[PDB]
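Note to self: the last two entries modelled the partners one at a time, which told us nothing about the interface. This time every component goes in together.
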Amino acid sequence: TPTKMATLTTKQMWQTIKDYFGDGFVTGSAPISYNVHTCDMQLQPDSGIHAASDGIHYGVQISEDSMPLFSIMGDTAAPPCTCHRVDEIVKHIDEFLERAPEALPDDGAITSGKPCDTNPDQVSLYAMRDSLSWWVHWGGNLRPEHYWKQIYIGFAAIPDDVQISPREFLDGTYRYLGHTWDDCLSGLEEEGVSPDEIEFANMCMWRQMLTQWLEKADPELLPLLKGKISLMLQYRVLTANTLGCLALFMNATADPKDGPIHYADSSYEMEIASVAQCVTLDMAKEAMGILQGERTEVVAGDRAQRKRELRWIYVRCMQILESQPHAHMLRRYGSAGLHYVPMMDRYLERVSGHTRFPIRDGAARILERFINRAELPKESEDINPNGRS
Amino acid sequence: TTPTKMATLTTKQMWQTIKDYFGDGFVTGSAPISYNVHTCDMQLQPDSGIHAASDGIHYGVQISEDSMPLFSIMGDTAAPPCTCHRVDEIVKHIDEFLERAPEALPDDGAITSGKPCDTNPDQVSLYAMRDSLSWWVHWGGNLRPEHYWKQIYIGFAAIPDDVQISPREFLDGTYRYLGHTWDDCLSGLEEEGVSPDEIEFANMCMWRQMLTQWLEKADPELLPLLKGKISLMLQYRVLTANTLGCLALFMNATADPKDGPIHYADSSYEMEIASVAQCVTLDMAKEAMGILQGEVVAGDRAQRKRELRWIYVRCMQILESQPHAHMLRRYGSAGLHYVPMMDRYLERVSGHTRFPIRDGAARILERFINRAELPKESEDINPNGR
Ligand SMILES: C/C1=C\CC/C(C)=C/CC(C)(C)/C=C/C1
Ligand SMILES: C/C1=C\CC/C(C)=C/CC(C)(C)/C=C/C1
Ligand SMILES: [Mg+2]
Ligand SMILES: [Mg+2]
Ligand SMILES: [Mg+2]
Ligand SMILES: [Mg+2]
Ligand SMILES: [Mg+2]
Ligand SMILES: [Mg+2]
Ligand SMILES: [Zn+2]
Ligand SMILES: [Zn+2]
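The predicted structure of the combined assembly is written out below.
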């Protein structure tokens, strides 16, 4: 086998994840591929009689009929089904990638929404803070055996706040806190994640990098999604990559004694949990007054109705999760935004005028080991200055 | 038979009654401020990082202690100093107050909600009913009618924080919560199948709450006496919040029916722990609400919060292995998601105003109002609720 090393074009990456993920329930949807048709989900009144081991006891439980009690919530309403037009979103992207250049002049630009950000590695450092904060609220710990899974969460965070070229992410030109993407894959191998598991998380990361970049590079894409909650929700869950992060979180959290995780068998419950968390993310952001106005706002337009539709989907996602095999992990994952948004600096910084909170010594010492200082550029050599020992 | 006697208890006899019921805690002479668990002796065990699917750690919100520095509204933790052995001095002072205090004060009935637009105490009760259902739901409960009177109980537990209620008027039926006397609630709990011994425990917890909520508003020398003594202030706040009595009824509504009736004698340990933990989450989440209101915490406040977090993480870790972790873990950490979502706290962030009760919420609250026993000035309460 002669050593070949040509890097894929952005168009070829898009085609690769098409071949890997295939179509979802809408023909022509690859790689925007979902198993569950949210519009066909049902919700039953709770019986009020539950066994001690029932899934309802996990996560945060808020019955649909109680939501009008919270002024920041309200009632629910079924959305109009726009799912079948996802193939039109794909064809649009296909056309955009056919004409877009392999490199944009603003690749590497900061898109965090916090104007005091000027160094992309400092933005990465704040993203590592955020990543560990999510991980903890999902139920995880900071133990060293999950280092590279936590780095994965960082890679999943940073393309939201920096415009990362998919090619540069792929070919190692882009580094997150000094790490290339391949470093993360190699580290996951060292941590014992199986090859097929790594490749799934890998393809989810390609898809995240691609969709994060597309919505920054294509001025028509976000306008095409807004107003169509089914399509917008499908897209925003890809840019958040809750599914890829979930797969690795399950790997880190499951006890091998309970038997191995059959991930294909769990694909539906995992998807539902990933969608549910993104809804609680925006539900809690709305309660903090930081959802309205952001460029990627999921509920833009008729905000009141779009939010009714999100709540409609959320309660149905959560009820289904009560009865899934991995409810002891996925219920909390699905509702985690309700407690991590009000506590995390990422969001309180937005409440506070889109500023930056200082990273105190305690947090800096945590973040230090996640920095590969040897591979930082000269202008970033002194990030996290209070975290060294 | 026995002749019909109906004399109402004096506020001292109320205080003495709950002393005989609750007895002393782990400190002698601490009745009725009785806690069996000494929070200062708690020890945090190391996290092996391996937890079975059935492990209680999966319930509620799990935040490892060593990760708390990542959050600017939090930080690290530090053990509190032990002042819980001075609780007997708090009792004897209260005795002194009640041996020279009237049975009726001038400002009994005044509104203490902290929201200046409140003028009608029955409207204040309506907002408290909204808050009560919101807590109940965030603990994990539902709105099914078989728990109506347990939800009324939460209302009785909420309202003494927002209205100065005389313990004797709460007892004799003079005070009505949305038209309900206290006896109406007790009678309803019986009709709902709560065993007599459970009702009486919840009853005595409500007696104790009404007394302590009234003592702190009446005696200006009580709270200053508590301030600076974190372990005593925390014990007193839990009594005035009545998380324990509310927990008892929530557990009764939520427990597996194959579970034998869960009596405080069986589970006093886990119930106290969970009751303390939830009150700490109030302090933790309210700091985030300060930012919303428009990180810099320092000095004694910052030290206070270090000690509350220390208690919280140790309480939550203990709940991992308790038999009712599938209920109490969520109860213990519930403030972390209900404070940022509830009107009660968003109203304060928004300038201590009041949010309108919209049609959907009014229709939920309607059935909790005994309109037949409302005063005339309150007959138009909850107008959009039919
Ligand atoms: C799976 C992740 C978190 C949960 C959802 C969320 C809040 C995403 C935001 C961002 C895209 C920045 C990070 C993704 C990492
Ligand atoms: C057990 C209760 C709620 C949870 C804790 C809390 C937020 C108390 C506030 C107040 C004392 C007004 C009500 C008590 C009812
Ligand atoms: Mg065009
Ligand atoms: Mg985004
Ligand atoms: Mg974003
Ligand atoms: Mg551009
Ligand atoms: Mg109070
Ligand atoms: Mg209060
Ligand atoms: Zn649809
Ligand atoms: Zn002590």
